């Protein structure tokens, strides 16, 4: 299509108005005194969130150029989310900030490219700075503090999270789902368990709800379905002999097997029942050895050097007992040596450090957690639906933040850390003048977070900022209590990693953005 | 698409006008002196209802922003309905109320977020308060009162309902359908019965209409059709022997079986006939044991350890007699021990407390009712169709209300309860001032219901409210009689549960809504 | 879509304008001096009717709100028609009436809901009232008068109708079809006969036109066709033996059977021929036992304990003779005891009182009429088509009216009955004042029918009405003769049932309608 090109100032301005719109719409939601925004939806009802990135995405401008600018800054708010799922709003604030000043300096007649470098440098510096102040977040107390501070000051949250982490361990998995009631609720799975119910409902051991509890069973693992392939009685009878209950796992099972199986377990011939493995081919099969090895079983290489009956009763794995309903199965404890356990674990180390990261290390550590650790789930409380969302939302942020503080430590919130490291680079200089401004520009912008927070409190951003800058170390203003003091003792912690990503991602784009001299796009 | 963002006051205002329109359109229908609204329909003729939620849903505004606010509030009216199918209008009124005030305070320059909290707390407070006033609704009288009150003061209703409940019991099922005549009618099913007619019309016992009355039959249950699988004569002849009638149930039956069956029963060889089981696989099957077990029969596990003929005459169940037409079948009474009954029932307790609730516990309790209790249906009378609707509509609310009153008691109507609990929290305070206002705001809104009611009577909302606030306990204004007194002795009861849901759901949204600082949506 | 809500007076007004348009367009056709309206049609040529309900349906307004009003009143006009196929126009007038007044009183500042009750009660009252005055319409004279009066005063009609009923009986069926000439014509079927011609055209007995007259035949009924299934000669020869003609009925007959049959009836071996049974499966079959039992035959349960040849010549039914063409068969008389006749009739009593009514009791009563009574059809005379329509139309109204007068008696026309019972409720009062007005309103409206009729004669509606009200009993104005007197002796009768439905249906909606406070619809 025919284009519309714009150069210099004109373009820039447009670009800026664009940024501001986006920015302004995300600022409103910063800090404890942060406010909400409503995203309309033709879909169902409008959405009410305080999640910066959530907002960003919805912003699109009619002015093709004002729009481009917005479409750009939008990615910082975005990347910031992919990085550590929080700090999004904050990051955005900084760009808005950097850009404003930057442009003003380009308008000042400076070479933009050096401004960029000056900023870049200024940032690389600021980063080491943070890494310096970053201090280990390890105790449950600290962990609940970031949770809480992340979930717009909700202790119940940090509290809950703190606990989960304290249970499932370090590699234990944690997820949030909408709860039933209005109270938040924490459930923690113990041992090995997945999402497969029994195909033989008739095979319900003791409790109802389809509760099966095969006491001291032999576990069986295969690689096929058993319609009429019922052949395998040697294996069967083998246990009928030892008089032990039996659990099975494979592609599937047809009535032919079940039917007979039924009356057998009935007549008190052999108390048994079975449930399908995990899910997809590579999936399920991927997850069995682990199971076998766990209970000390010998998975059946139906595809390799094994067959149906082709397998002795001793191949079977053994566990205290099991618990099954119409949807899930759980092994109380497959007696399997730790030489085996940590072994099947050690080999997970390569799986872990993977270049796939997302979706890979997810379902990955899951088993990892089930192969020794513990799995946890959180249910969010909310009367309405428009509440259940927002709530559950923040809950995750925090869930993330903690994850980050742990791996990368923390620093002082209230955007003090930055304002602090800023003073530390008061003497940073670069190759030429422009560059020095470029730096100065950046430092100057690092007061953004802080004073937006303040402003979201209807108070003098500049006045606070001063008194705060007059202080040292972790002296900081507490927006919530409206009084200064030590940000850490007050439990106002920001996972070091977010603060860093926010600054980086922010600059990464801001920088470029301010080096626009021309812009092309379609006609109105 | 290109968006249109609005911040602060502008946005709010718009949002509010939006709310108002909706609200205002729902108010009109509040109380005995509430009026109706007409909802247009391209479909057929317009609809005339006084059901708040019915109205809500139809409201959509041209102004994108005004619309959003409307689209939000709409959910309280909604959720309120999913909760206890009544109080919808009332709920709405409170939001309208809360928001108005709220915004006024934000306009006053207060932190919205604290306002929210102030409100939330004031509410959590207000709830215990109600649970205090809630008093058990257990006698048929009270129950008749809520139904009546619910059905805009129609005694006939509460009366009818009260009856139904008094019959089918507590776990007895109750449903409402359109009636033939103009009078309302109550039918109550006794014992075991379902929606299945006979495949062998020839096999009609005594009365007409397809009336079968197998005196002292042997009930038979299967898991497959019987085209030429007619093999089973043993079982058959086994009764030709005993000379007792026989009832059958299964996936189906082809004439092959029927044909011969006809002349057998004819010649006086064997008085018999059969009808299809419930409906879907897991369905029908899920419902048979009960049947069997009830009548003392042995369901045929055509899929498990059994086969056609594979079964003895004693396996069959026995019942006083049965009654069948071309659409329904009924068992007079299958002689089956209570140990069995309450048993088959007890195991329903898990089915009962289910995380499925909607649709689950529905068809669930149904059987639960047929499994010892009773099933009832109500036919609403109406001359027209636009009448049958409205009518049958209100009849259900009541139906629900009562259901709610029973499980959660009641409190004083006329919106006195609230107005009362408000005085009780006159000393409630929060962490800061804004929050205290946030509380005051809410308490203030709790007068809404009452004074909208009054206003729907062309009377001083503020003057009544006063004299009402001057009183104590259940002193309250009777809009209908236009004179004060004891709301309970006057039988003006609100199922505690609705009053509570209305307040919660209302606030849950209003709360958020008043913390809007920006709004985004598409362009006009 | 974006809506447009309207409250109070505004809404009401619009609504009313809507009603009026509709109403006014239907009024014009009320009474002997009623005029016509033309309904356009893209289809073919415009339609010219005086049938109120025909009109109503065609009315749709551009003003969404004016339209809603009209879409609602439209239902009274409608329902009135489903109820008893006449009085439509009349009904409408009352609504128009009720509403007008009603609204005026709401405008007066009265509680609408009481208004409604006032009206409702006033009506329930008015109904017993009518049931009082209703007097049995039994003599043919009376019956001709309602037909006549119904068919806008056409004696020829009431005359013809009276006859029919006098013939076919009470349960005899009567239908109207376009006739051939210009004179109306009445045909009356005697005995048993349906719409099936002979497959064996060659088997014509005596007259032409395919006229068959098997003297003292043996009727034969089956449940299948006969291509090569010609096997059955035993039964055949058994008659060749007896030497009697033969009639056959079944799913069909192939030439194979026919061919041979031809020459057989030809060479004088066996005078026979056959014709297909009724129509659909459950249709035809449903209609055979009846045929059998009548002539005294044994239907062939080709599907049950019976086969082809499998049946003795005695099973056959017998009849005096038959008459068939290429489209119709008829049994002079199948000697079949009345024990069987009325038996097969008595069991029709449940078929009769069926919760189906529409479509059921139709084809049902049909056979019923053929199983003892008589069947009649009327052919309407008209030069044109636009005439044949109108004509035939009114003819049915009367056909229904009579039906109604018969079952529910009659009362004095000219809208006197109502105006009369109104005076009777001059002292009716309700729980409060608003309600008394509500009542008064209604009574006042009952003068509508009468004075619209008067107005349709260019005369003082108020002057007549007065003199008419001064009178007693059935004193009434005769619009046609323009002179007062006894409405009954003049034969100006209205089937009690319609008069009643028109009032009920009318109020039923009107009532609700005047309680509108808001209205929602889409934008223009
Ligand atoms: N009570 C408080 N007083 C002062 N600063 C706070 C307080 N609570 C949180 N903060 C700071 O304000 C920031 C608010 O971040 P937030 O608004 O959630 O944006 P993001 O989406 O970027 O986290 C926190 O990261 C922290 O630095
Ligand atoms: N006769 C009466 N006098 C006073 N208050 C009444 C009377 N009848 C009902 N009410 C009160 O007014 C409310 C009206 O409820 P309604 O108009 O149906 O709204 P919702 O659909 O929210 O219940 C009742 O719930 C009760 O609190
Ligand atoms: N000559 C007459 N004088 C007085 N009243 C009459 C006369 N003819 C008919 N009527 C009355 O007017 C009615 C006319 O019916 P009609 O105009 O077709 O309206 P609808 O279709 O509502 O019956 C009759 O039912 C009867 O009540
Ligand atoms: Mg955050
Ligand atoms: Mg209600
Ligand atoms: Mg008429």
DSSP secondary structure string, A489-501? TTT-EEEHHHHHH
Q: How far apart are CA C87 and CA C107, in angstroms?
A: 30
Dihedrals phi, psi of A229, to nearest 5 degrees: -70, 20
User: What's the DSSP call for residue C376?
Assistant: E
- The shares of helix, strand and coil residues in chain C, as percent rounded to the nearest 5, are 50, 15, 35
Q: Cβ contacts (< 8 Å) between C350 and chain B: which residues?
A: 208-209
User: What's the DSSP call for residue B352?
Assistant: H
Q: Which residues in chain B precede a discontinuity of more than 2.5 Å between C and N?
A: none
Contact (CB, 8 A) for B210 and B236: no
- The response to whether residue C36 sits with its C-beta less than 6 Å from ligand 3 reads no
CATH superfamily of domain region A1-134+410-524: GroEL-like equatorial domain (1.10.560.10)
User: What's the DSSP call for residue A355?
Assistant: S
Residue B248 has, within 13 A of its CA and on its CB side, a CA count of 28
In Å, how far are A19, A37, B14, B66, B96 from B11, measured between CA atoms?
A: 20, 10, 5, 9, 17
Q: How far apart are CA A126 and CA A121, in angstroms?
A: 9
Count CB neighbours of C45 within 10 A: 12
Ligand with the closest atom to the CA of A32: 1
Which own/partner contact pairs does C8-12 have at CB distance under 8 Å and 24+ positions apart?
C8/C517, C8/C518, C9/C107, C11/B38, C11/C65, C11/C516, C11/C517, C11/C518, C11/C519, C12/C103, C12/C106, C12/C107, C12/C516
Contact (CB, 8 A) for A297 and A334: yes
In sequence order, what DSSP letters do the residues of A41-60 get, joined into one string?
-SSSS-EEE--HHHHHHH--
Contact (CB, 8 A) for A288 and A213: no
Contact (CB, 8 A) for C105 and C438: yes
Residue of chain A with shortest Cα separation from B522: A40
Contact (CB, 8 A) for A23 and A73: yes
In Å, how far are B323, C177, C285, C355 from B204, measured between CA atoms?
A: 10, 40, 18, 20
Residue of chain B with shortest Cα separation from C66: B40
Q: How far apart are CA C207 and CA C325, in angstroms?
A: 10
Contact (CB, 8 A) for C210 and C204: yes
Q: Which of C84, C414, C450 to mutate to test the pocket of ligand 3 (most atoms within 8 A of CB)?
A: C414
Query: Which pairing describes strands B246-249 and B218-221: parallel, antiparallel, or unpaired?
Result: parallel
Q: How far apart are CA C49 and CA C254, in angstroms?
A: 49
In sequence order, what DSSP letters do the residues of C414-459 get, joined into one string?
TTHHHHHHHHHTTT---SSHHHHHHHHHHHHHTTHHHHHHHHTTTS
User: What's the DSSP call for residue A482?
Assistant: T
Q: How far apart are CA C168 and CA C175, in angstroms?
A: 11
Contact (CB, 8 A) for B506 and B94: yes
**Residue A45 Rama label (left phi>0; alpha psi -120 to 50; beta):** beta
In Å, how far are A191, A198, A301, B503, C436 from A279, measured between CA atoms?
A: 20, 14, 17, 45, 74
Tell me how many residue pairs between chain B and chain C have CB atoms under 8 A apart. 119
3-state secondary structure of C506: helix
Start-end of H helices in A335-447: 338-346, 348-352, 360-370, 385-408, 416-424, 433-445
Residue A279 has, within 13 A of its CA and on its CB side, a CA count of 5
Q: Which residues in chain A precede a discontinuity of more than 2.5 Å between C and N?
A: none
Q: How far apart are CA C286 and CA C360, in angstroms?
A: 13
Beta bridge partners of C259: none
Contact (CB, 8 A) for B404 and B142: no
Contact (CB, 8 A) for C438 and C122: yes
Q: How far apart are CA C177 and CA C378, in angstroms?
A: 6
Contact (CB, 8 A) for C466 and C450: no
Chain B residues within 8 Å of chain A (Cβ atoms): 1-3, 5, 7, 15, 64, 68, 71-72, 74-76, 79, 109, 111-113, 301, 303-305, 347, 350, 355, 504-505, 508-509, 512-513, 515-523
* Residue B512 to residue A386, Cβ atoms within 8 A: yes
CA C274 to chain centroid, in Å, comes to 35
Count CB neighbours of C72 within 10 A: 27
**Which segments within C246-374 are labelled E, that is strand?**
246-249, 272-274, 317-318, 329-331
In Å, how far are A339, C278, C291, C301, C330 from C336, measured between CA atoms?
A: 97, 21, 10, 20, 16
CA dihedral B223, B229, B235, B239 (to 10 degrees): 100
Q: How far apart are CA C48 and CA C50, in angstroms?
A: 7
**Which segments within B164-245 are labelled E, that is strand?**
173-178, 185-189, 192-194, 218-221
Which chains does chain C touch, 3 or more C-beta pairs < 8 A? Answer: B
Residue of chain B with shortest Cα separation from C519: B38
3-state secondary structure of C497: helix
3-state secondary structure of A224: coil
Q: Which two tokens stand for residue C106?
A: 């709401």
Contact (CB, 8 A) for C17 and B34: no
- The response to whether residue A86 sits with its C-beta less than 6 Å from ligand 1 reads yes
Start-end of H helices in A307-384: 338-346, 348-352, 360-370
Q: Which class does domain B191-371 fall in?
A: alpha beta
3-state secondary structure of C307: coil
Contact (CB, 8 A) for B330 and B324: yes
Overall resolution, Å: 3.0
Q: Which residue has the tokens 């304990």?
A: C305
Residues making up chain A, counted from first to last? 524
Burial class (CB in 10 A: 0-12, 13-18, 19+), C394: buried
What is the three-state SS of B69-99?
HHHHHHHHHHHHHHHHCCCHHHHHHHHHHHH
Q: Which two tokens stand for residue C523?
A: 């934008």
Q: Which two tokens stand for residue C467?
A: 């003199």
Picking from C106, C492, C66, the residue whose alpha carbon sits closest to that of residue B28 is C106
Count CB neighbours of A225 within 10 A: 13
Chain B residues within 8 Å of chain C (Cβ atoms): 21, 24-25, 28-29, 32-40, 42, 45-46, 48, 55, 58-62, 67, 180, 202, 208-209, 255, 259-260, 262-263, 266, 382-387, 390, 457-458
Burial class (CB in 10 A: 0-12, 13-18, 19+), C238: middle
In Å, how far are A79, C198, C200, C294, C331 from C320, measured between CA atoms?
A: 98, 19, 21, 12, 8
Contact (CB, 8 A) for A375 and A157: no
* Residues 6+ positions from B440 with CB-CB distance below 8 Å: B118
Q: Cβ contacts (< 8 Å) between C513 and chain B: which residues?
A: 48
Q: Angle at which helices B496-513 and B88-107 pack, to 10 degrees?
A: 30
CA A347 to chain centroid, in Å, comes to 24
Burial string for B267-290 (b: 16+ CB within 10 Å, else e) reads eeebbbbbbbbbeeeeebbebbeb
What is the three-state SS of A244-310?
CCEEEECCCCCHHHHHHHHHHHHHCCCCEEEECCCCCHHHHHHCCHHHHHHHCCCCCCCCCCCCCCC
H or E stretch covering C388: helix C385-408
* Residues 6+ positions from A376 with CB-CB distance below 8 Å: A164, A167, A168, A172, A173, A174, A175, A186, A187, A188, A189
In Å, how far are A328, C94, C310, C452, C454 from C77, measured between CA atoms?
A: 61, 10, 58, 16, 21
- The response to whether residue A491 sits with its C-beta less than 6 Å from ligand 1 reads no
H or E stretch covering B115: helix B112-133
Picking from B18, B112, B124, the residue whose alpha carbon sits closest to that of residue B62 is B18
H or E stretch covering C110: none
- The response to whether residue A87 sits with its C-beta less than 6 Å from ligand 1 reads yes
Q: How far apart are CA C254 and CA C242, in angstroms?
A: 25
Beta bridge partners of B351: none
Contact (CB, 8 A) for B79 and B92: no
User: What's the DSSP call for residue C324?
Assistant: B
Sheet-wide strand order for A36-39: A47-49, A36-39, B516-520, B6-7
CA dihedral A7, A8, A10, A11 (to 10 degrees): 60
3-state secondary structure of B7: strand
Contact (CB, 8 A) for A47 and A54: yes
The alpha-carbon radius of gyration of chain A (Å, integer) is 29
Q: How far apart are CA C493 and CA C86, in angstroms?
A: 13
In Å, how far are A427, B152, C51, C159 from C175, measured between CA atoms?
A: 108, 47, 19, 15
User: What's the DSSP call for residue C289?
Assistant: H
**Residue B473 Rama label (left phi>0; alpha psi -120 to 50; beta):** left
**Could you tell me the sign of the dihedral formed by the alpha carbons of A453, A456, A462, A467, in that order?**
negative
3-state secondary structure of C403: helix
Q: Is the domain B135-190+372-409 a CATH 3.30.260.10 member?
A: yes
Q: Cβ contacts (< 8 Å) between C1 and chain B: which residues?
A: 60
User: What's the DSSP call for residue C380?
Assistant: E
The three-point CA angle B216-B221-B223 to 5° equals 165
**Residue A168 Rama label (left phi>0; alpha psi -120 to 50; beta):** alpha
Sheet-wide strand order for B173-178: B173-178, B375-380, B185-189
* Residues 6+ positions from C75 with CB-CB distance below 8 Å: B45, B384, B385, B386, C505, C509
3-state secondary structure of A323: strand
**Residue C41 Rama label (left phi>0; alpha psi -120 to 50; beta):** beta
Burial class (CB in 10 A: 0-12, 13-18, 19+), C356: exposed
Count CB neighbours of A501 within 10 A: 26
Q: How far apart are CA C120 and CA C129, in angstroms?
A: 14
3-state secondary structure of C489: coil
* Residues 6+ positions from B87 with CB-CB distance below 8 Å: B80, B494, B498, B499, B501, B502
Beta bridge partners of A37: A49, B518
* Residue B303 to residue A255, Cβ atoms within 8 A: yes
3-state secondary structure of A431: coil
Dihedrals phi, psi of C493, to nearest 5 degrees: -110, 140
- The response to whether residue A147 sits with its C-beta less than 6 Å from ligand 1 reads no
H or E stretch covering B244: none
3-state secondary structure of A449: helix
Domain extents for chain C? 1-134+410-524, 135-190+372-409, 191-371
Greatest extent of chain A over all pairs of C-alpha atoms, in Å: 93
Ligand with the closest atom to the CA of A498: 1
User: What's the DSSP call for residue C322?
Assistant: B
Contact (CB, 8 A) for B220 and B316: yes
Q: Which two tokens stand for residue C13?
A: 């007004």
Count CB neighbours of B23 within 10 A: 25
In Å, how far are A192, A347, A351, A352, B1 from A361, measured between CA atoms?
A: 19, 14, 7, 6, 36
């Amino acid at each position: 299509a025919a284009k519309d090109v714009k150069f210099g100032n004109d373009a820039r301005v447009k670009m800026l108005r664009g940024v501001n719109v986006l920015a302004d719409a995300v600022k409103v939601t910063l800090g404890p005194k942060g406010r909400n925004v409503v995203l309309d939806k033709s879909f169902g009802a409008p959405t009410i969130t305080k999640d910066g990135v959530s907002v960003a995405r919805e912003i699109e401008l009619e002015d093709k150029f004002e729009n481009m600018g917005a479409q750009m800054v939008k990615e910082v708010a975005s990347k910031a989310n992919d990085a550590a799922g929080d700090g999004t709003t904050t990051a955005t604030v900084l760009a808005q900030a950097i850009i404003t000043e930057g442009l003003k300096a380009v308008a000042a007649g400076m070479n933009p490219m050096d401004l960029k470098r000056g900023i870049d440098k200024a940032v690389t510096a600021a980063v080491e700075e943070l890494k310096a102040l970053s201090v280990p977040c390890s105790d449950s107390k600290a962990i609940a503090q970031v949770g809480t501070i992340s979930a717009n000051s909700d202790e119940t949250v940090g509290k809950l999270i703190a606990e989960a982490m304290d249970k499932v361990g370090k590699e234990g998995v944690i997820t949030v789902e909408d709860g039933t009631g209005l109270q938040d609720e924490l459930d923690v799975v113990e041992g090995m368990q997945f999402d497969r119910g029994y195909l033989s409902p008739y095979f319900i051991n003791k409790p109802e709800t389809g509760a099966v509890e095969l006491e001291s069973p032999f576990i069986l693992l295969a690689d096929k379905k058993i319609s009429n392939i019922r052949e395998m009685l040697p294996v069967l009878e083998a246990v009928a002999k030892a008089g032990k209950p039996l659990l099975i796992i494979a592609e599937d099972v047809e009535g032919e097997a079940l039917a007979t199986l039924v009356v057998n377990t009935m007549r008190g011939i052999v108390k048994v029942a079975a449930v399908k493995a995990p899910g997809f081919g590579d999936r399920r099969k991927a997850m069995l050895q682990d199971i076998a090895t766990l209970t000390g079983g010998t998975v059946i290489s139906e595809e390799i050097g094994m067959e149906l009956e082709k397998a002795t009763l001793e191949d079977l794995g053994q566990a205290k007992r099991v618990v099954i309903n119409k949807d899930t199965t759980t092994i109380i404890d497959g007696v399997g040596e730790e030489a085996a356990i940590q072994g099947r674990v050690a080999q997970i180390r390569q799986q872990i450090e993977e270049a796939t990261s997302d979706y890979d290390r997810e379902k990955l550590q899951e088993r990892v957690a089930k192969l020794a650790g513990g799995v946890a789930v959180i249910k969010v409380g909310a009367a309405t639906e428009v509440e259940m969302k927002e709530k559950k939302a923040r809950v995750e942020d925090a869930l993330h933040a903690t994850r980050a503080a742990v791996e990368e430590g923390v620093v002082a919130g209230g955007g003090v850390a930055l304002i602090r490291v800023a003073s530390k680079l008061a003497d940073l200089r670069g190759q030429n003048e422009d560059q020095n401004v470029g730096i100065k520009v950046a430092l100057r912008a690092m007061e953004a977070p802080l004073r937006q927070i303040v402003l979201n409190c209807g108070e003098e951003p500049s006045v606070v900022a001063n008194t705060v800058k007059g202080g040292d170390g972790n002296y900081g203003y507490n927006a919530a209590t409206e009084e200064y003091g030590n940000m850490i003792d007050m439990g106002i912690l920001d996972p070091t990693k977010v603060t860093r990503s926010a600054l980086q991602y922010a600059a990464s784009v801001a920088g470029l953005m301010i080096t626009t001299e021309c812009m092309v796009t379609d006609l109105p």
